């Protein structure tokens with residue numbers, strides 16, 4: 001697909017067995033999801049942006065479907081105001097910026 | 100150009116006659132640059148990121164050349180961790196996401 005940027009590039013993702021809406025975010029190194037009680041081992045991490053840092057839980061090798069495209073990788077879980085698909089997964093679904 | 104996402108989509112911009120490096124950020128509504136001087140009037144504003152809210156200076160109708168493509172639009176100046184080109188200007192230079 002081609003997604004214009006007149007509005008926020010929100011798309012449907014699937015993780016665990018939850019469908020969520022998430023930003024396709026070229027400015028995010030990592031994928032950061034709103035708080036959810038995922039199974040498995042995790043490690044603590046702090047990630048920074050505008051306003052400062054938040055504490056997150058790093059889960060590895062989590063399968064995620066993004067607009068029907070399969071991905072699997074690291075997902076950070078914490079008190080983000082928006083679900084963010086970062087470059088670690090955008091590359092996996094073949095996403096590019098074009099102009 | 101087509102820009103893949105295995106690396107941060109950093110580009111050179113020209114603004115106020117100065118060259119800077121900035122991140123093409125589809126997860127950002129607004130363009131936010133690190134502390135700098137710009138001429139003309141500005142308005143105090145607040146924006147919210149992953150870590151909380153910050154104060155910024157809103158400069159309107161500012162010309163900015165991004166990777167050789169011309170935009171003229173709003174630029175926010177404040178304590179962002181990195182210069183970010185948000186959707187208000189990405190749309191001007193005809194940027195889309197594709198996969």
Ligand SMILES: CC(C)CN(C[C@@H](O)[C@H](Cc1ccccc1)NC(=O)[C@@H]1CN(c2ccccc2O)C(=O)O1)S(=O)(=O)c1ccc2c(c1)OCO2
Pocket residue numbers: 025027028029030031032047048049050081082084086122124125126127128129145146147148149150180181183
């Ligand atoms: C600031 C950039 C460099 C990084 N951010 C991604 C942005 O796309 C972010 C994603 C994002 C979007 C919204 C809310 C939180 C985060 N956008 C914004 O902060 C700006 C603020 N804002 C905004 C919000 C409200 C009013 C005016 C505004 O301009 C807006 O529209 O975009 S991030 O969310 O902090 C981030 C994501 C993954 C990461 C990371 C940091 O480190 C490791 O892995």
